[PDB]
Design a binder for this molecule. Sequence first.
Ligand code: 8PF
Ligand code: 8PF
Ligand code: 8PF
Ligand code: 8PF
Ligand code: MYR
Ligand code: MYR
Ligand code: MYR
Ligand code: MYR
Length: 581
Amino acid sequence: HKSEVAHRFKDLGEENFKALVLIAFAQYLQQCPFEDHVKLVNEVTEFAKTCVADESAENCDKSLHTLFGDKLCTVATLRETYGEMADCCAKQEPERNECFLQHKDDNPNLPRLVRPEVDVMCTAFHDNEETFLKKYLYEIARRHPYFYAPELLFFAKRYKAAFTECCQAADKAACLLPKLDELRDEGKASSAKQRLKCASLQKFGERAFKAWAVARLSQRFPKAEFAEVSKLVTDLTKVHTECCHGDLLECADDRADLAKYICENQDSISSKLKECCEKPLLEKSHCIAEVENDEMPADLPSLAADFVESKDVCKNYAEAKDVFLGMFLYEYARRHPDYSVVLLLRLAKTYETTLEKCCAAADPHECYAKVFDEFKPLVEEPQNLIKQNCELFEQLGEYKFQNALLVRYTKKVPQVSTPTLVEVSRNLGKVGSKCCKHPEAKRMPCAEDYLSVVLNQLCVLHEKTPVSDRVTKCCTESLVNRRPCFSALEVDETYVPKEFNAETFTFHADICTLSEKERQIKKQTALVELVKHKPKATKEQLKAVMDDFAAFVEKCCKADDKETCFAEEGKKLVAASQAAL
Ligand SMILES: O=C(O)C(F)(F)C(F)(F)C(F)(F)C(F)(F)C(F)(F)C(F)(F)C(F)(F)F
Ligand SMILES: O=C(O)C(F)(F)C(F)(F)C(F)(F)C(F)(F)C(F)(F)C(F)(F)C(F)(F)F
Ligand SMILES: O=C(O)C(F)(F)C(F)(F)C(F)(F)C(F)(F)C(F)(F)C(F)(F)C(F)(F)F
Ligand SMILES: O=C(O)C(F)(F)C(F)(F)C(F)(F)C(F)(F)C(F)(F)C(F)(F)C(F)(F)F
Ligand SMILES: CCCCCCCCCCCCCC(=O)O
Ligand SMILES: CCCCCCCCCCCCCC(=O)O
Ligand SMILES: CCCCCCCCCCCCCC(=O)O
Ligand SMILES: CCCCCCCCCCCCCC(=O)O
């Protein structure tokens, strides 16, 4: 109302307010120590409480943008430490605010955050939970300055749930370590996803983005009328566009206003939002973004009537090409929550190509009579890819599925570095476990959701240091062609076997003494090097060498004086292996 900071403090509650202020400041003042940020937070919090006590107390009617900038410009070492950023303080609002957005550091050169020992974590968590939690919130925020602050706070609350539970349990390490792995992977995916949607808006443009949203919103809210979906898609593009411009408060206000619109209109949208729409502002937009798909209307026609049979198909199309194509996308996607959005975009684009050709024909109805037959192969290709891979994740388990991928992908693009081949192949196997566990109807969307970040990881890595033309081609293909292109890659014909290196296939007794993870990575590193040396080896021959090594490790980890039969019984492996292939 009169005091933005008082209204924020009253909507958020003191605990959330303090945490969000810490995140916000940590993301701009990335090189100031924890101590100094605790101080900014306590000052902003005591100021906010004076505004809550009296909205017309001094400085309480200042904009939150103004107060944020004022406190940044108050920092004593700002020019010494952040240089150019201090020059933003010479400008007036709103130009000061825009100058700060430009001058955050993407890659602050901070050491990797090392996971301490369970004992050390659980003790620190016990002795001062808030300093432990807030210090890690600070460490993560300074390192991820574009991470949406409310989403970083939702992660913090899950970390705190994981410590509260696990620091009291019998086997602390057995409880905690898997939860921290899941959270790390979920957090990294959310950080990659957030960056990619903004890069993609810029790369592929606003039209592609609105198509993507029509498809997603129609799957989620299949009972909403097209005009409601189109209104939601218009507001969603504005939210996403503001959010990518990088102003946290503008992004939060835009999200909150859309959340409120959706909650005020549940009857026109979904029967699934009641619980989300009872949450406080902080959790409401988060909650909606995760909501389950509504059930579609039971009694939906064939799309044939409006999109093939109707004699007004070309007239309807020519009148507003993107609205008609959007209506097609809406009707297709509301019927297929089991499809990837990109599959729905391939279908939409196939229909566009066909109406473009055939609406420029004397008997349009004849030219486009059988358009629906072109959808058959497009739909099956990813359905088959999922069946074949999710039934291999069955036969094998996660680890041996990663191994099957390792051999498949090393043979397709053997020029890729071993660490990239091991990383992507491990990650693609963990996409198996996230998504092959889901029923049929959720498999292709789960797969899409996780492949988009996995293949972006692989591409970004790749275009910073290229190695393969065919990878570059798939990475610079259209949105809809990227995955099909990767899946179309054939075993590399032109690749020359890599010259045998004796070191690479030398193992010691330490291998018996590594975590499960490090031992899998050492083995997977060797496997890739095996395929790189002998790319001609077949399934039968590689299984034979793998089973030989498998039998070697088990024998040479049981034996007395292990490190010798590793040297000795291990040179027998490497000779027997070379000949055999
Ligand atoms: O690109 C990255 O930097 C990344 F986001 F870390 C990613 F590794 F690609 C990832 F998608 F997060 C992921 F961790 F591989 C994963 F989430 F897909 C997973 F495989 F671990 C899960 F199981 F979550 F799918
Ligand atoms: O690969 C891309 O860059 C792309 F933009 F995603 C696309 F393939 F062109 C598309 F977005 F799907 C699309 F074809 F333009 C469309 F399907 F979105 C549309 F044109 F049909 C509609 F009007 F439906 F938005
Ligand atoms: O974009 C999607 O993937 C989606 F599924 F359509 C959606 F995420 F539900 C969303 F509805 F678009 C949305 F962004 F989550 C939202 F609008 F519902 C919101 F409430 F989160 C915001 F806050 F954006 F309003
Ligand atoms: O078709 C499939 O099996 C798939 F799983 F959907 C796929 F993920 F797209 C993939 F094609 F396997 C792949 F992961 F994209 C890839 F093979 F292209 C690669 F990323 F692993 C490499 F590095 F080999 F290019
Ligand atoms: C999100 C704020 C609080 C986070 C508390 C967790 C700190 C311990 C784990 C940090 C190490 C990096 C994450 C990981 O690899 O699991
Ligand atoms: C002066 C420092 C104030 C900065 C605090 C930022 C507060 C963010 C509010 C987030 C509200 C949630 C909205 C949403 O994502 O739907
Ligand atoms: C081995 C890859 C991940 C595990 C599940 C198999 C995924 C293959 C199909 C993915 C296709 C969805 C996106 C698309 O339509 O292009
Ligand atoms: C000249 C080639 C040396 C032969 C050594 C092969 C090492 C690779 C085996 C990788 C094992 C993965 C599967 C398993 O656990 O058995």
